[PDB]
Amino acid sequence: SPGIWQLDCTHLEGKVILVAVHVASGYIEAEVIPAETGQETAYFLLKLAGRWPVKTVHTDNGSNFTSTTVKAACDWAGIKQEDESMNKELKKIIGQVRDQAEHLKTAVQMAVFIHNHKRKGGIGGYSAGERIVDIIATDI
Amino acid sequence: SSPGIWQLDCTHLEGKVILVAVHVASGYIEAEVIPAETGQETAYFLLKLAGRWPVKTVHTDNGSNFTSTTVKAACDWAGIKQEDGIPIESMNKELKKIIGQVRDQAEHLKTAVQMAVFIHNHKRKGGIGGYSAGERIVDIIATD
Numbered sequence: 001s002p003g004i005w006q007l008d009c010t011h012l013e014g015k016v017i018l019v020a021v022h023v024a025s026g027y028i029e030a031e032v033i034p035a036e037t038g039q040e041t042a043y044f045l046l047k048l049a050g051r052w053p054v055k056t057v058h059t060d061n062g063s064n065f066t067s068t069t070v071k072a073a074c075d076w077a078g079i080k081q082e083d084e085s086m087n088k089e090l091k092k093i094i095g096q097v098r099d100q101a102e103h104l105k106t107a108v109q110m111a112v113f114i115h116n117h118k119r120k121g122g123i124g125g126y127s128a129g130e131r132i133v134d135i136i137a138t139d140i
Numbered sequence: 141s142s143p144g145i146w147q148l149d150c151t152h153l154e155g156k157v158i159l160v161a162v163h164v165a166s167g168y169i170e171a172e173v174i175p176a177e178t179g180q181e182t183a184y185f186l187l188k189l190a191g192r193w194p195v196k197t198v199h200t201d202n203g204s205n206f207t208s209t210t211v212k213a214a215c216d217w218a219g220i221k222q223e224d225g226i227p228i229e230s231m232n233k234e235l236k237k238i239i240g241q242v243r244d245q246a247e248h249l250k251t252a253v254q255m256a257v258f259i260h261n262h263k264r265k266g267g268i269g270g271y272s273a274g275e276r277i278v279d280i281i282a283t284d
């Protein structure tokens with residue numbers, strides 16, 4: 001469970017949002033990139049893997065994920081590759097704040113901040129951020 | 141050191157800028173190549189970082205990029221207190237060593253920096269019974 005992520009793209013305003021969801025926690029990382037390239041994908045994956053303990057990524061069938069640069073990055077970083085609730089949610093927060101910023105990429109990271117900090121449930125609840133650190137700390 | 145305290149520093153290599161955030165208690169790092177130390181680039185780095193880990197305070201070098209109104213606006217929004225000029229120099233030293241060990245596997249410097257971040261955060265310190273910066277940050281931050 002703790003090493004598993006799902007990666008998805010979302011299309012808005014002529015660019016691509018790459019979104020990686022930590023499956024057990026709902027925690028997200030996201031980045032706006034100009035186009036969905038093998039290179040951009042590979043880079044997003046190395047960044048994520050130096051930050052969190054990434055064992056497996058679950059992706060769509062896209063040609064970006066089967067590129068030699070993506071395969072080189074996965075081999076080096078130790079990532080096995082394979083083939084919405086949190087993601088429609090992200091798109092909705094983007095809308096709730098998109099107004100508040102000049103560029104989309106600013107509203108996107110504002111949305112990540114909001115998602116990852118938000119307590120789910122009542123008093124006794126946890127944010128997605130809290131849940132991922134607890135999951136990984138427990139594992140260790 | 142609080143679990144919420146970060147130190148930001150910059151390094152220049154090959155004519156490019158590397159912004160580095162160090163989690164002071166653990167030695168964990170986040171780093172990115174940016175085009176130039178502008179307010180808008182520094183603000184965006186901080187917004188990203190604060191969205192990923194619980195950032196309470198940032199100690200900075202008091203560079204002109206931090207005096208930017210946009211950086212203050214970002215810290216305010218994210219609930220970060222900015223402490224300028226308030227003192228890991230062997231960190232910017234450390235990252236450049238590791239960047240040299242991987243530089244030949246990467247066509248572009250920015251890729252080599254993420255590779256170095258990865259090696260840094262996974263490295264066991266203190267010998268075979270020790271722990272990585274990555275292990276230490278989650279242990280320090282975990283509330284339950």
Ligand SMILES: OCc1cc(-c2ccccc2)on1
Nearest residue numbers: 129130192193194281282283
């Ligand atoms: O369980 C400890 C904890 C984790 C966080 C956190 C908040 C936001 C992003 C990542 C982690 O806050 N408290």
Ligand SMILES: OCc1cc(-c2ccccc2)on1
Nearest residue numbers: 106180183184187213214217
């Ligand atoms: O200019 C890029 C940018 C701006 C911000 C910002 C975030 C929150 C409030 C105000 C400004 O973050 N990155």
Ligand SMILES: OCc1cc(-c2ccccc2)on1
Nearest residue numbers: 050051052053140261274275
């Ligand atoms: O040893 C398991 C483990 C790995 C990590 C980690 C966290 C952040 C970056 C790199 C590694 O945390 N717990």
